[PDB]
Amino acid sequence: ENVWYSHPRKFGKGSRQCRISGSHSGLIRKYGLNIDRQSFREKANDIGFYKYR
Amino acid sequence: KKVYTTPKKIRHKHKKVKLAVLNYYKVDDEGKVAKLRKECPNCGPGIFLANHGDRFYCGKCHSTFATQK
Amino acid sequence: MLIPKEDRKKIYQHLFQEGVLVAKKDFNQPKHEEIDTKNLFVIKALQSLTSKGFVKTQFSWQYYYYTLTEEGVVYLREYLNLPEHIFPATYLAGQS
Amino acid sequence: QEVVIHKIRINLTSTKVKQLENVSANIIKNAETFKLVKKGPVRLPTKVLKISTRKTPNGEGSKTWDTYEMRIHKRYIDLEAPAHIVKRITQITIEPGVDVEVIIAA
RNA sequence: GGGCACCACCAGGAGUGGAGCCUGCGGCUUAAUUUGACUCAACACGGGGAAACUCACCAGGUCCAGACACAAUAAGGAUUGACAGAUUGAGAGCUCUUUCUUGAUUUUGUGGGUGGUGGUGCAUGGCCGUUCUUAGUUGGUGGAGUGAUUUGUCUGCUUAAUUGCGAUAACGAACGAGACCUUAACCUACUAAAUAGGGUUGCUGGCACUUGCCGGUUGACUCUUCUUAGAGGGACUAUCGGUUUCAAGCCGAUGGAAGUUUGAGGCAAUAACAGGUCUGUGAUGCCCUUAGACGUUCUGGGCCGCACGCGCGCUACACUGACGGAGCCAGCGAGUACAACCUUGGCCGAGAGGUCUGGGUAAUCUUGUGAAACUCCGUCGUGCUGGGGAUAGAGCAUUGUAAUUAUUGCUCUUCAACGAGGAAUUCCUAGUAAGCGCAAGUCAUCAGCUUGCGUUGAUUACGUCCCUGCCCUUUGUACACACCGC
Ligand SMILES: [Mg+2]
Ligand SMILES: [Mg+2]
Ligand SMILES: [Mg+2]
Ligand SMILES: [Mg+2]
Ligand SMILES: [Mg+2]
Ligand SMILES: [Mg+2]
Ligand SMILES: [Mg+2]
Ligand SMILES: [Mg+2]
Ligand SMILES: [Mg+2]
Ligand SMILES: [Mg+2]
Ligand SMILES: [Mg+2]
Ligand SMILES: [Mg+2]
Ligand SMILES: [Mg+2]
Ligand SMILES: [Mg+2]
Ligand SMILES: [Mg+2]
Ligand SMILES: [Mg+2]
Ligand SMILES: [Zn+2]
Structure with missing residues (x-):
């Protein structure tokens, strides 16, 4: 309802949230994942990413 | 943690000074009505002007007048 | 909570039509998908509903999910007017 | 009557390799x-998607890493054949996992 | 006593420690210069290259996002809104000036939640690190003990390995190691291709001018060596020689793409640590807080300050160079349609960078990423010199809302310290070391960082327990919260 409740958050750390936590910390934005790295690690196997070498 | 600063002066949201059956409008005869101040040109009748010293506005269009009356 | 009641009504109607509701966890968003109201408002409404039973809520992956219980459905109907043999998603429309 | 070869x-793109081959x-x-x-x-060359990530959450202890990777397998089958035939092919031979896809326009 | 290891040392290399500068961390400073973590296992770590955001800190302001329960107003308004200038950092109705809107949402209380980059990792989960990638661990019988326990699990010799051979109240087993997996190497043997490369030939450019040489064109036809990447093989220490109770194995020649576990990793036991993380987490106990918040959110700073310590790092102390030309070759990658990605090709600009145009959702276009270090001919010749490039001043650019507390780039100018660095100490055994650049990661903009990549490519061992650590065995023990012990 108030007028000024928004700085321009188009880009940077503030704009890019993650899908799961909604954090701005260790954000894997490679290949359009948008996942905080820990979260990715936790799920990587389900998202097709496996450790080989 | 660090202690809070304490200047002192607090400001609260105003309670508004509510008033109803306001002294706007009148009737003299009984049958017909006599409007006081004036209605809005932009919006339809039913809404009424705010009257000040050569300064007007209305609330349905938040506040958008300029000309006197 | 401070809702222009029309918007709320619209939201309710939408919910009824659905038998379901999916929202973001995104406050500051100017307008929701489908409904022409603020997402935040919708979320608030949903929360309120949950607080008085009715709706079941899940907060997974920045997406609030919402489904109506029988009681909730009844309440919605009451709010609306619509009597009986109506939409939601408690039963199929025809063959699908 | 037609016999119009487009x-x-x-x-044929996939992660699972054996399945793709079978397809x-x-x-x-x-x-x-x-x-x-x-x-x-x-x-086509197997494109590998590499995600290097510090194994830690908190970045405390030794500085260990995990290269998680994804194998992409991409195959092409070029048919000098009609439209109807292509349609038929599309209809039959669909498996799970493999991304079947048609270009159609030479 | 006996093992093992370039996180040990030898024999050597490269170094760091000195110099300047980057960046971490102290200390001081500061409103605040947010916090976590300090032997290896803190200190270019938090993917932590902070311009706001991030952000937790400070100065200031805004907002409820106080779910729900129950009463006080319940329209003679609950509370919602509100242009105008003073107000206000301020086109924050932040309000006090105002007198118009708003219609029961609310709101005033009382139960009751909710949020918190608040606290406590010595309340926890999960994950990670470390003991340890070391070689260790276990139980079923059977034997020794009343018993805790023990033997098996070991004198020796082997091995990277509790790896094996052997000797044997132990026998056969499991876990760990190995096997396994992925990748790095071989395939003129298969299956394949105008999104990979060639051969003949058409047209076509130039040459010598005979037939021949280099080309350019997706014009035709055909091939799969290189390419990819499917299926397979191929190495098993193979053959031979010694050596070793003629065992395990090891050592040398031959062949072989490969003979260091073929190279490199991925995983990786039992038991743990009061190691780290409650600042990844709608992982969370409890406490605190809880509507002028320690919630949120704006605005301006701050993490970057400097008498000074250490820690990763870069740049150099030049002649194996510097500077000019010229030659000119990689591999990992990555890259947009709801955005604004990589961006060739053309013109403008000394540059940076602008512009028009494309091509690319990608073996197709960027891209042969014609990367550097290198190689060739010339200019300075061993002088704090043209080595070295710091601090500096100015302007030109770009990113963004915002560039001063230079973001970064470029242009001219300034030319400081430093003639190979003491005590100390790091890393290393082969395509390694070191050099060299690229590459993505973070990223609007910033690389001295990082994970990878390839290019150039050595010196010296191929041993030992001297040091250091660790492991066992035998010993001793007033220790068991276990030497930071008693
Ligand atoms: Mg405060
Ligand atoms: Mg260690
Ligand atoms: Mg810093
Ligand atoms: Mg480092
Ligand atoms: Mg910065
Ligand atoms: Mg939080
Ligand atoms: Mg918390
Ligand atoms: Mg702990
Ligand atoms: Mg602790
Ligand atoms: Mg027994
Ligand atoms: Mg034993
Ligand atoms: Mg022999
Ligand atoms: Mg190996
Ligand atoms: Mg290419
Ligand atoms: Mg000079
Ligand atoms: Mg960095
Ligand atoms: Zn009006």
Whole structure:
């Protein structure tokens, strides 16, 4: 309802949230994942990413 | 943690000074009505002007007048 | 909570039509998908509903999910007017 | 009556490799059955998606890493064949996992 | 006593420690210069290259996002809104000036939640690190003990390995190691291709001018060596020689793409640590807080300050160079349609960078990423010199809302310290070391960082327990919260 409740958050750390936590910390934005790295690690196997070498 | 600063002066949201059956409008005869101040040109009748010293506005269009009356 | 009641009504109607509701966890968003109201408002409404039973809520992956219980459905109907043999998603429309 | 050859490339992209191979084989068999002019299953370079990530959450202890990776397998089957035939092919030979896809326009 | 290891040392290399500068961390400073973590296992770590955001800190302001329960107003308004200038950092109705809107949402209380980059990792989960990638661990019988326990699990010799051979109240087993997996190497043997490369030939450019040489064109036809990447093989220490109770194995020649576990990793036991993380987490106990918040959110700073310590790092102390030309070759990658990605090709600009145009959702276009270090001919010749490039001043650019507390780039100018660095100490055994650049990661903009990549490519061992650590065995023990012990 108030007028000024928004700085321009188009880009940077503030704009890019993650899908799961909604954090701005260790954000894997490679290949359009948008996942905080820990979260990715936790799920990587389900998202097709496996450790080989 | 660090202690809070304490200047002192607090400001609260105003309670508004509510008033109803306001002294706007009148009737003299009984049958017909006599409007006081004036209605809005932009919006339809039913809404009424705010009257000040050569300064007007209305609330349905938040506040958008300029000309006197 | 401070809702222009029309918007709320619209939201309710939408919910009824659905038998379901999916929202973001995104406050500051100017307008929701489908409904022409603020997402935040919708979320608030949903929360309120949950607080008085009715709706079941899940907060997974920045997406609030919402489904109506029988009681909730009844309440919605009451709010609306619509009597009986109506939409939601408690039963199929025809063959699908 | 028609016999209008549009020249149609079937793409075949996947992660699971054996499955993809099987699919390709099936496609080839189908082609043989239908007896058409086609270039055999061309195999493109396996694009690997690498995500390097510090194993830690908190970045405390030794500085260990995990290269998580994804294998992409991309195959092409170029058919010098009609539209109807292509449609038929699309209809039969669909497996789970493999991304069957058609270009259609030479 | 006996093992093992370039996180040990030898024999050597490269170094760091000195110099300047980057960046971490102290200390001081500061409103605040947010916090976590300090032997290896803190200190270019938090993917932590902070311009706001991030952000937790400070100065200031805004907002409820106080779910729900129950009463006080319940329209003679609950509370919602509100242009105009003073107000206000301020086109924050932040309000006090105002007298118009708003219609029961609310709101005033009382139960009751909710949020918190608040606290406590010595309340926890999960994950990670470390003991340890070391070689260790276990139980079923059977034997020794009343018993805790023990033997098996070991004198020796082997091995990277509790790896094996052997000797044997132990026998056969499991886990760990190995096997396994992925990748790095071989395939003129298969299956394949105008999104990979060639051969003949058409047209076509130039040459010598005979037939021949280099080309350019997706014009035709055909091939799969290189390419990819499917299926397979291929190495098993193979053959031979010694050596060793003629065992395990090891050592040398031959062949072989490969003979260091073929190279490199991925995983990786039992038991743990009061190691780290409650600042990844709608992982969370409890406490605190809880509507002028320690919630949120704006605005301006701050993490970057400097008498000074250490820690990763870069740049150099030049002649194996510097500077000019010229030659000119990689591999990992990555890259947009709801955005604004990589961006060739053309013109403008000394540059940076602008512009028009494309091509690319990608073996197709960027891209042969014609990367550097290198190689060739010339200019300075061993002088704090043209080595070295710091601090500096100015302007030109770009990113963004915002560039001063230079973001970064470029242009001219300034030319400081430093003639190979003491005590100390790091890393290393082969395509390694070191050099060299690229590459993505973070990223609107910033690389001295990082994970990878290839290019150039050595010196010296191929041993030992001297040091250091660790492991066992035998010993001793007033220790068991276990030497930071008693
Ligand atoms: Mg405060
Ligand atoms: Mg260690
Ligand atoms: Mg810093
Ligand atoms: Mg480092
Ligand atoms: Mg910065
Ligand atoms: Mg939080
Ligand atoms: Mg918390
Ligand atoms: Mg702990
Ligand atoms: Mg602790
Ligand atoms: Mg027994
Ligand atoms: Mg024992
Ligand atoms: Mg022999
Ligand atoms: Mg190996
Ligand atoms: Mg290419
Ligand atoms: Mg000079
Ligand atoms: Mg960095
Ligand atoms: Zn009006």
